From a paper:
After shortening the AMTS13 exposure to two minutes, however, the mosaicity decreased, permitting acquisition of a dataset with a resolution of 2.6 Å. The AMTS13•rmAChE structure resolved by this approach is generally similar to that of the apo rmAChE, with an alpha carbon root mean square deviation of 0.27 Å for monomer A. In the AMTS13•rmAChE crystal structure, the well-defined electron densities at the bottom of the active-site gorge reveal no sign of a covalent bond between AMTS13 and Ser203. Instead, AMTS13 spans the active-site gorge, with its linker adopting an extended conformation to interact with side chains of Tyr72, Tyr124, Trp286, Phe297, Phe338, and Tyr341, and with its ammonium group engaging in a cation-pi interaction with Trp86. The –SO2CH3 group was undefined as the electron density of the inhibitor is slightly disordered at the opening of the gorge. While this structure does not support the reaction with the catalytic serine residue, it does support the concept underlying our design strategy, namely that the ammonium group of AMTS13 is near Trp86 and its methanethiosulfonate group is located in the acyl-loop region where the insect-specific Cys resides in mosquito AChEs. Moreover, the crystal structure shows that the methanethiosulfonate group is distant from Ser203. Our AMTS13•rmAChE crystal structure supports the initial reversible inhibition. We also found that the strain energy of the most solvent-exposed disulfide bond in mammalian AChE is about 0.6 kcal/mol higher than those of the others in mammalian AChE, according to the density functional theory calculations using the coordinates of the AMTS13•rmAChE crystal structure and the procedure detailed in Section 4.10.
Another important factor in pest resurgence is lax control measures owing partly to growing concerns about insecticide safety. Such concern may be well founded, since many insecticides phosphorylate or carbamylate indiscriminately a ubiquitous catalytic serine residue at the active site of acetylcholinesterase (AChE, EC 3.1.1.7), a serine hydrolase vital for regulating cholinergic neurotransmission in mammals, birds, fish, and insects. AP-AChE (AgAP-AChE), is present at the entrance to the active site of insect AP-AChEs but not at that of AO-AChEs and AChEs from mammals, birds, and fish. AMTSn have a trimethylammonium group on one end of an alkylene chain to confer affinity through a cation-pi interaction with Trp87 at the active site and a methanethiosulfonate group on the other end to form an adduct preferentially with a free cysteine residue. In this article, we report data confirming that Cys286 of AgAP-AChE or its equivalent in the Ae. aegypti or C. pipiens is targetable by sulfhydryl agents and that AP-AChE contributes most of the measurable AChE activity in An. gambiae s. str., Ae. aegypti, and C. pipiens.
Residue numbers in the entry:
A (entry chain B): 4 to 257, 265 to 543
B (entry chain A): 1 to 257, 265 to 542
The structure:
Amino acid sequence: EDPQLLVRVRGGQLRGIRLKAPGGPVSAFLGIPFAEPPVGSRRFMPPEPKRPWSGVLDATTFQNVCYQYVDTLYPGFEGTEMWNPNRELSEDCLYLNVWTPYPRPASPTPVLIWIYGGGFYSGAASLDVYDGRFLAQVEGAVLVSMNYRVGTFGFLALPGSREAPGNVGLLDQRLALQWVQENIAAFGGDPMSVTLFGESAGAASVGMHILSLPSRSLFHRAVLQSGTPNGPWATVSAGEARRRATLLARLVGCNDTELIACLRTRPAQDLVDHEWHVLPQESIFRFSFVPVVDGDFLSDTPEALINTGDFQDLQVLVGVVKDEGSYFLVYGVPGFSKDNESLISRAQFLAGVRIGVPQASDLAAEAVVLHYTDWLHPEDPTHLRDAMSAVVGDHNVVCPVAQLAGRLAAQGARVYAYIFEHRASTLTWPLWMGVPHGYEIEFIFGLPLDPSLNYTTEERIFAQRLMKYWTNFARTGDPNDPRDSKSPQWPPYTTAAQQYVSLNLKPLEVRRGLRAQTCAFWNRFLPKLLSAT
Amino acid sequence: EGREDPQLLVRVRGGQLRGIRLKAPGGPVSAFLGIPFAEPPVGSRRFMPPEPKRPWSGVLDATTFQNVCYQYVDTLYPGFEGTEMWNPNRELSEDCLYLNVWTPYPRPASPTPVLIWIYGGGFYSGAASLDVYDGRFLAQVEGAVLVSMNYRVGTFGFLALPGSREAPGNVGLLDQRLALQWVQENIAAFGGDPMSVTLFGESAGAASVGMHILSLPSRSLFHRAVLQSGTPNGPWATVSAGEARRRATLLARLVGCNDTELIACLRTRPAQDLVDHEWHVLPQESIFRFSFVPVVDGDFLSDTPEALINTGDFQDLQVLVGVVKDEGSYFLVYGVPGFSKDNESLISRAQFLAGVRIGVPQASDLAAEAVVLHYTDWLHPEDPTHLRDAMSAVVGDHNVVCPVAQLAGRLAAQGARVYAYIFEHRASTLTWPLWMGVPHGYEIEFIFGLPLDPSLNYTTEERIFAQRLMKYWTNFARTGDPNDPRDSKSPQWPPYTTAAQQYVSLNLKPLEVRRGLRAQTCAFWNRFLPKLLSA
Ligand SMILES: *[C@@H]1O[C@H](CO)[C@@H](O)[C@H](O)[C@H]1NC(C)=O
Ligand SMILES: *[C@@H]1O[C@H](CO)[C@@H](O)[C@H](O)[C@H]1NC(C)=O
């Protein structure tokens, strides 16, 4: 009975398991319950804290993945399967995982908390790309990740109802945050230094915790990778949430109480079977059940809240990958496949824009097409294909991020910004997608440090830099190596200079303006064009 | 005659003329100045189409420039060379329909290709007697036959009550056309070839050339065309019948006045009264907008230039078109608040947004925001230096560069052989501030070969640059191709095409081919904007 792998939290005792990291062992405590299972009549409900348990809870394996849609686009293909559930699906999924150094940290170690993405309809803390052993071993970090309910189970709301209030998936995340405050010290973590980080919907979730007062007392810094609370896909209005809820009730044969009761009696998979059929138009990068502006968790829209918020003692690191948009195109944009080079016609390009900006009037769609056309080569399919990707990435990630960065900087926050431009040598997607949404994660978690994975040696040294930036930021709110001259320095992002850095195999390069002209189009012009139809 | 120079006596359809032997750096030229080509458009003929000049008796002296067409005189900067060089340099008069001819001396052996200059000046000003329009250098150095005419400007040239008999509109254009006919009938007497006539002009001169291309009756009077910094399409060169009627009647009101009775009253007002009120009839505070311009009458212009270029066949047509680097700067100092020739005109963002409302007077609030968003440098949105240059670019792009881009595109796509350039050399002798760069109108002195006059103080490289230009221009007149058939060592100037969109730069360095004439931005103006303000 190894004492290092024994811990006492408020609910009782846990036994973790010693794991092998390339350069040493780490303590891992997997599958810790932080809430009463959200099953039966608890479905759609805010989480309750897990009840105490007798004896020693075996905490040595990953628990169930939250019930969610499973991808079929490219069955067997690693590039998609790597995102699929790698454990059994269950509504009983409210568990977190903790990795520490082995032996346990002598003094209180900064805590990093990972929040996975997946459009708010999928994701699991157990995926290999989120393996915390590397940062724990190498940077001596204490790392936490949780599951939170997705799709209908986490975000289906009948706003104002008692039995489907909305945002329960975010409440799951908040509950795990509180658990970390109350328990992390037992593991050698510092509850007074907690950094959230996440990607895609995970980044947006972090963003929402920034924008929701009750969450604020639970962390000190935030890292948002390729996702924001603001923007087209991350939130919906109370009205539109009510709309999608009842339409789904209808699709499954169903006053709120009555409706919600009948929904609670449907097998999980019946709900998932119609998840995708409540969307108001044909679209990409749009998801059926996501956080809802309820005047509660979110008191106003994210855009309102970031405009008027005070972000004084906040430090935030934000960034995007070189090709945010490409991944989404193969999911139903006519012309795109991972198999051909998806060179497209001008006709397909226009068609793709109606889908990419589902909310756009004819005139607005025209404006997008004109802005993104290369008038020197208005009909070259390589340009058209790339352009289609940029529309999607820019509309949904880059410009929302540029927007957020500016507002936080302007309003007191210390902001650091990056763009990730290195395509992994082991990447299974076609070259034309470049560096897609999701593919910086393996580097930040340090997977290339595992030799059996067959990353080049440069990628290994890269991974080490990234882990150092992230953990430095975690320790100090500044990504820069606190004793190290010349890189040169990573400068803060400010509305004036608008400096950000390029993360790739070459040393840090400071650039100015994150797509400034194009984000002006998306952030400043398009809105006028639509709020005037 | 008897003791007169025998090579300066020439007969034309209306009578005998005596010309003058002028000095040019490389030798003498024959000049015939102030040849009347129309009945004085005075009295009951004001606003009326020109009638051919009635034959005269004896030898008409053609040794000096004639009256300049009655017009507004610039007062912005008294005595300043930069403005004065464009001001009238002869007595103002409604009796002003005269043309000028320059030929080699003695006159050429075989029939020489003919160049015809049409001065610009917003359709409210201009004169063929200005120094920058001196044909003596092209005639001497290139052996060209060069012809320039006066045509009526302002109210006298363009005030229209469309439909009416006494003020049909476009008579200024008709003055121009009559001089073209005059050249057809008479230019052989000077050694000119009526079978080889090239039109060239600048600003409203260029738009004029454009309208002759779009007007059937003019089509048979010339073979090739050059448009410098101007087009028949675009926002300032024409008005609808409705708008011209409106401006015509508003002006009559302003001076104290059934169209017949209205026009009849106007014909009694002194020319100066008309000039003194012509700027007051514009719909909005604006730059690069003129009160009295060609009207779309379903006659001279059968439809809009925009329409006609979109649908006409231009198989048989060669055209050279271009722009200067800084088309807009000149206009900013005429009443965009913040700008002056005496300081750097560094402006504020507020002054930039105010300037945009003025430069795009037709623009709704949304359209003007679009313009400002497109032109703001979002890295330095407050930088007074980018704002000043952006303001100049807005004016230049909207009024010239994008209409010209649009024109070259449509013409090439429909038959024409098109050559395109941007002129980028600031004259060492320029009196305007550096911030203005290469302003509207400042290529002209090079094309006409002024730097060849030793007393002028141009640099030697400029003197050589001028010769290159005169060469491209005359080569195009002769052949429909600017390129020297001999010189293949020198880099070639390729036609402009929808496919490649190639054009050359014109500076002290050798020809450099570039691709895309402000393509992205011109998409904004030519494709997006029109659709926008249909809302
Ligand atoms: C330049 O001159 C004009 C007129 O005198 C003036 O209105 C403008 O403000 C001046 N610019 C500056 C900033 O000195
Ligand atoms: C050219 O330079 C000479 C020498 O100073 C000067 O006297 C003359 O006036 C100048 N001519 C012009 C046109 O400026």
